[PDB]
Design an enzyme around this catalytic site. Sequence first.
Site, short mmCIF file in Angstrom:
data_model
loop_
_atom_site.label_atom_id
_atom_site.label_comp_id
_atom_site.label_asym_id
_atom_site.label_seq_id
_atom_site.Cartn_x
_atom_site.Cartn_y
_atom_site.Cartn_z
N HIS A 1 -1.50 1.56 -2.89
CA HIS A 1 -1.55 1.47 -4.34
C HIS A 1 -2.67 2.36 -4.86
O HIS A 1 -3.73 2.46 -4.22
CB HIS A 1 -1.76 0.02 -4.79
N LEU B 1 -4.14 -3.31 0.31
CA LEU B 1 -3.47 -2.37 -0.57
C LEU B 1 -4.03 -0.96 -0.48
O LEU B 1 -3.44 -0.04 -1.03
CB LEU B 1 -3.57 -2.87 -2.01
N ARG C 1 3.34 -12.18 -13.97
CA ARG C 1 3.06 -12.74 -12.66
C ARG C 1 1.55 -12.87 -12.52
O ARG C 1 0.84 -11.86 -12.63
CB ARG C 1 3.65 -11.86 -11.57
N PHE D 1 -1.74 -4.12 -11.53
CA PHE D 1 -2.44 -5.33 -11.16
C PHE D 1 -3.86 -5.24 -11.66
O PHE D 1 -4.49 -4.18 -11.53
CB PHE D 1 -2.54 -5.51 -9.63
N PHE E 1 -5.71 -13.94 -6.33
CA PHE E 1 -5.12 -12.68 -5.90
C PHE E 1 -5.13 -11.66 -7.05
O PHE E 1 -5.94 -10.73 -7.02
CB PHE E 1 -3.70 -12.95 -5.36
#
Length: 164
Positions: free
Chosen positions: A125, A121, A54, A112, A59
């Site tokens: 996270h 976040l 992804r 990520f 982002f």
Amino acid sequence: VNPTVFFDIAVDGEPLGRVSFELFADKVPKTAENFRALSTGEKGFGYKGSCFHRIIPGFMCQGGDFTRHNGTGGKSIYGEKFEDENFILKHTGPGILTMANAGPNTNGSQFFISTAKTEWLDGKHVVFGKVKEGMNIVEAMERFGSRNGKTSKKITIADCGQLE
């Protein structure tokens, strides 16, 4: 003292370049060690050959699902999932490594790499590293993403390991 790990990235099997990360073992030692060990493969499994499934330009890039290749798999060196270690570090800008999760205390192997500031976040996270060298290669990867996250070419970790 903090470990450095590298990923060699490929695009449909063709080399793109290397990205190296500093892992903040001084502040999140359990989370940093999971990523370090998955990068060397020293426990018998890890990131080598796995894909970034992804990528959303502006982002983040997401990877680490080395068992199902689509965001539904992965596991940590501690078991299927482990706890949020702390939220000392913040999502300040591009180049931050932060754990993906599915709720509180559900860290596995997915992560990520931010390509923007992602302050929403913070406190959800666990931030545990940063890009040290090769942010230009993350920027190049980002061009193979799309708004819904599907990649136009297959982006893989062709090799990975520890540099120091």
